[PDB]
Design a protein around this ligand. Structure first.
Ligand SMILES: Cn1nc(-c2ccccc2)cc1C(=O)NC1CC1
Ligand SMILES: Cn1nc(-c2ccccc2)cc1C(=O)NC1CC1
Lengths: 296, 302
């Protein structure tokens, strides 16, 4: 009991919140400083695989300063009776703000315009944009991030529709989201943003079939989880012009090995920057350290 | 003003609005220099887009011409020198392109906070740079809006939904009018050290030329992000480069330049600078509206 190890670049608040003692290092190999301590606090870079869990028998708790636990093997943790804790609310506003920024960039081609300007060109006829006022935005997944995207985009005069099998049409109405059966959403949207968890039913939620049901020239945003938008189906939709543009923060493989999507003229992307703000990092670091201190 | 000639192709509603206003309308397209002169002989009004060139020779030959209407705000195909000499009034559409300029502004703020254009360029170069693009959350930040007209108010209400504190200044707009859209007015000197973000929405005049300069950048909070989607010259381009070079300005988003396109590439080429080729009014929606807005302005005169 009580002794923590930080193996990733975290906010200094995570350290000052003590609890008792903390040892902090960065960019360690699988071989690392392999002496770990009873506690382990990670972000995304440090891999908490089966081997490191087995090599550190003294380790009692693994904590992640962020959403989800993709870099932590849950099966190997439950094997040695190690509890896994994360910060599901620490990134909410930053992921929502980034999603909103992506919609803006898609409607006005801001990254492409910046690239063209840097290429020494002044081509204003090429970049004929779209006004968001009066356009329909479809929000798939009406949790915390989906709700924050909605209220922000409502200020732009966007019609906010969507679907969530957990959030009732009455509850989504109270935050201005008109809920319709999923099949009725696709033909009405000018823009689609996904905020569903990664699940068997949501894997390829946007596929060749659902893209065919979309309004020709639809714009798609994925700042949630890699795989919700079928990457193969998205490319085919961009090549045909069924999808006029796409904004991607997340990918099925990180970094993406397949470059066809990233290299597309109508595709704007970010290297998983959803939670990459000093505010979300400080919140995630604070929320993980306090639940580690909470131990009695 | 009795007879109006629409020399270019816009929306069919423009002719209808002029007709409802009791004006005689003649709609033609792709007229030659000689044919444009003959048609204008009994015209007091002319409605143009970009294709029809209203040169000095045209203006001087159309002696009955009194008003020249333009499909948008800016300059291109009309000789202002000849129009000023003959006392002809030139009309533009600011409130018809306003909304799209306000949306671009908001887009530029989100782009500055998270470096989306830069992150995209990095990704297109096959790079995966997580540490390089550590961004800022807009929630709780202070946005300074210098110019509180139609664009200024539209930016304000949109950025207020992001939990941004909207403060500003406009000598023409009353404190009461700005308070109605949640913008607290304070004098210029008090604005500079409070802002995390600054956006300008004023016309270009001597009182607004170099509004953001070396003196005002020094008064600004270190790491300020500036947006200019209004007119080239409001932000002193020389002063802005110095602020980016020292870090006094963390980043800038420029849709406009003192010279368009700019010859000096130092601003555009800067890593912390986001730019567009004057796209503020470049949406299918704003272009489809300007024609309708000229007709309304011509009728608002009669
Ligand atoms: C199970 N599930 N499915 C979807 C969904 C939404 C749109 C389309 C398809 C699936 C969302 C969720 C979900 O967990 N919602 C939680 C309340 C935040
Ligand atoms: C002439 N003028 N000057 C400024 C101004 C603002 C902040 C600072 C300095 C000057 C704004 C205006 C102006 O025309 N406002 C109209 C409502 C659209």
């Amino acid at each position: 009991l009580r002794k923590v190890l930080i193996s990733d670049s975290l906010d200094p608040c995570c350290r000052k919140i003590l609890g008792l003692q903390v040892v902090e290092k960065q960019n360690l190999s699988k071989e690392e400083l392999i002496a770990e301590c009873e506690g382990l606090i990670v972000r995304s870079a440090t891999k908490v695989t089966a081997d490191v869990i087995n090599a550190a028998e003294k380790l009692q708790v693994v904590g992640r300063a962020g959403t989800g636990v993709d870099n932590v093997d849950l099966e190997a943790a439950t094997r040695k009776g190690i509890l896994v804790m994360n910060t599901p609310n620490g990134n909410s506003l930053s992921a929502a703000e980034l999603t909103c920024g992506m919609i803006m960039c898609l409607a006005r081609q801001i990254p492409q315009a910046t690239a063209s300007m840097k290429d020494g060109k002044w081509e204003r006829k090429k970049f004929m944009g779209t006004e968001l006022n009066g356009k329909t935005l479809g929000i798939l997944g009406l949790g915390r991030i989906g709700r924050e995207v909605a209220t922000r985009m409502q200020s732009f005069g966007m019609k906010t529709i969507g679907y969530d099998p957990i959030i009732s049409p009455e509850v989504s109405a109270s935050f201005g989201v008109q809920q319709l059966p999923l099949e009725e959403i696709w033909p009405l949207c000018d823009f689609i943003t996904v905020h569903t968890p990664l699940l068997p039913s949501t894997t390829g939620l946007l596929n060749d079939n659902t893209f065919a049901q979309c309004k020709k020239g639809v714009r798609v945003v994925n700042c949630a989880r890699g795989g919700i938008v079928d990457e193969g189906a998205l490319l085919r939709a961009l090549q045909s012009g069924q999808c006029a543009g796409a904004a991607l923060d997340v990918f099925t493989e990180e970094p993406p090995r397949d470059r066809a999507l990233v290299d597309h003229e109508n595709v704007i992307s970010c290297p998983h920057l959803g939670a990459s703000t000093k505010e979300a990092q400080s919140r995630c670091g604070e929320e993980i350290a306090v639940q580690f201190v909470d131990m009695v």
